[model samples]
Target chain A: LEERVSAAEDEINEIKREGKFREKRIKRNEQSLQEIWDYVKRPNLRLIGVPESTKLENTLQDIIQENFPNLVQIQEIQRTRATPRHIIVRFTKVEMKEKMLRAAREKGRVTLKGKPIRLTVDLSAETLQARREWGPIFNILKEKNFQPRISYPAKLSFISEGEIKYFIDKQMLRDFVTTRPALKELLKEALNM
Target chain B: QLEERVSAAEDEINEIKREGKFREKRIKRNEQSLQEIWDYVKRPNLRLIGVPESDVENGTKLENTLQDIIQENFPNLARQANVQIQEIQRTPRHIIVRFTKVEMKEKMLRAAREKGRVTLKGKPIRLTVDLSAETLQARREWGPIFNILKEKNFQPRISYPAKLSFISEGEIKYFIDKQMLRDFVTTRPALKELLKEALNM
Candidate 1:
């Protein structure tokens, strides 16, 4: 009976050893798969802010075209004299967004009209809604003279190499529209049109 | 008992070999992952510090001033030595005039201040003036001279664009031949007359 009990114990130990080996192999494979996914699926997002000066527009355009030729495709630019000067420049790719933000931060002050131009990715929708509900927090913050800051929901998502759509919160937009006197006129014009 | 001992030793060796293989495999995997990460990490080439317009202008002025000084002081070396004035910029105070070319640099060094000595780098009378030190000294000595120019309401604005422009207008606008201006200030009866003649007004 003692010999039989010893044999049973040995078999149980062997089974545990095999189970641990299999777990290691499974874990390694899972980790490898995740690494590959991260490599292939990283998102590259850029945001740029430019001053509302006509003289700087050319400089800004040249800089963008020179630095990020692959990402920038000038689709359409529209300008309207609404109270204080402002320009709405649209690019073809989302990747150009970040380059614009960097340029605005670095070179904006150097522009003909020396003002600190702010640049940020419009990520309002992501903050307010969980794939359903939306917020306009960015607009509200802007109205309070607050600049929008970025938050990465997932590091793995950032690793993806694709254009990620960006949205600003509706409340932030509302605040920007209502709070700033200069922006109010522009917002009114935009709403009317 | 001897045979049992040998068998136990062999089992221990096998266990160590297995662990070694596992560690090697993990290390190899990690190395491959790191290599992949290296491909994505890239440094940007663009330097955000834009070259100020004033610096370029200052460089040009320093270059011209150095040429004038060389022509006046060491004409023989100036002819033989390919003396070109290169501007070394200091944002606010001084613009340095650098003399390049080995021959010219040596000649200036040899002709130390027995004639009109400008001490640079603690070296007496050198031709290739380290513009940085020279400009500082030049400003220190020429402050009163400049004040005279300014007091006479001489808006000694240069034709070149300032290197940097801010929202508020605070800029260094004048680039003058320091020696020529100094000579004029000291020789003339009043600062106003000197300005009128210097400006050809």
Candidate 2:
């Protein structure tokens, strides 16, 4: 009975190993899925802080046509489930979208009736979720003046001490904190978040 | 003993199923989005067809052939403005022409349509506004209405590259799909027979 219990435990660990890994894997694939998603959803845009009520007015359509002047017209403009409600703009034509995206990025903020708004690339939901978990490490990295960017398939990419560093997930962040001890309080704060 | 093995296998399959679902969603969603993206990117293009393969001696033969067609057909406009062609692709051999000025593009379109037939190297070629695959597929399903419109001089047309338009009340009016086409069909009862005969519906 004890051996069977041990056998049960063994199987439990074997599977538990993956629950941890698989969760991270989901986010990891989420990152890769986005790169693949970009190519598939060509010329789509993500706009932040855009009001949901103006969807019928085609606020994005009016904005695009004005900025570029008959360059691009969008197929769909709807808000993503993300907080602050990012508007996913599906614009037609690669050249125009690139031009429009470039314009949007350069300004860093677009105005709607004189209200400055944020514009960005439409990323995968999984990638966004993964990014949420990188908060503690990202804050610490930022404090050290290390450039931190959440990477695809759920990995942390940062520059520290003139060297590029990668942390794969929350566990990796926890591991780094364990080794350094400096980030302990930050980890506590992150967990609370 | 059996419980351990069964549950273990079940656990293993659970993960497998999750992976499969994730993968399937990723691929299917990406595929649909990618097609839209690709079509969106190609929005500023004109799909040129029926031109022969690029010359063996010069790969740029297709480009030159298109330029030749434009120069010969719309000589005045070619001299006034340079047509910007971002890229050319094969397999379907459609020349993707990007005209900087929408009006200039319109002029060329008018010229081509006025003739009703265009030729390159003595073989007939077709020109169309570049459309997303979604629009193209949706339009392809208009075969029944397409023939119904064709059987008469009433001049049924595909508008916006996806919708149906025809001479109604001596003015061109548009309809979204066959369901919309039903309104017009009821007005002209003979159209029912034409649609049935044309579509084999």
lDDT of 1 by residue, B36-73 (tens): 34322211110111222342453445455455555656
Query: All candidates: CA RMSD in angstroms?
Result: 26.0, 15.7
Off by over 4 Å in 1: A1-193, B1-57, B91-94, B117-201
Model 1, span A101-153: residue lDDT tens:
66555554423334333333333232313222322333433455445333322
TM-score for candidate 2 (chain B): 0.55
Candidate with maximal DockQ: 2
Q: What is the per-residue lDDT of model 2 for residues A1-193, given as tens digits with 9 covering 90 to 100?
A: 5575576567567666756665575565455456555444555667777656555336866666555443445556676644567777776444455667667755666777767777655556655577776776678768877777764446787764576778877777666666655546555567442
Task: Using TM-score, give the best candidate's number.
Answer: 2
- Per-residue CA lDDT of model 2 for B87-122, tens digit only, reads 344523566666555665667776787777777656
Fnat per candidate: 0.00, 0.00
User: TM-score of the second chain in each model?
Assistant: 0.27, 0.55
What TM-score does each prediction get for chain A alone? 0.29, 0.47
lDDT against the true structure, each candidate:
0.41, 0.63
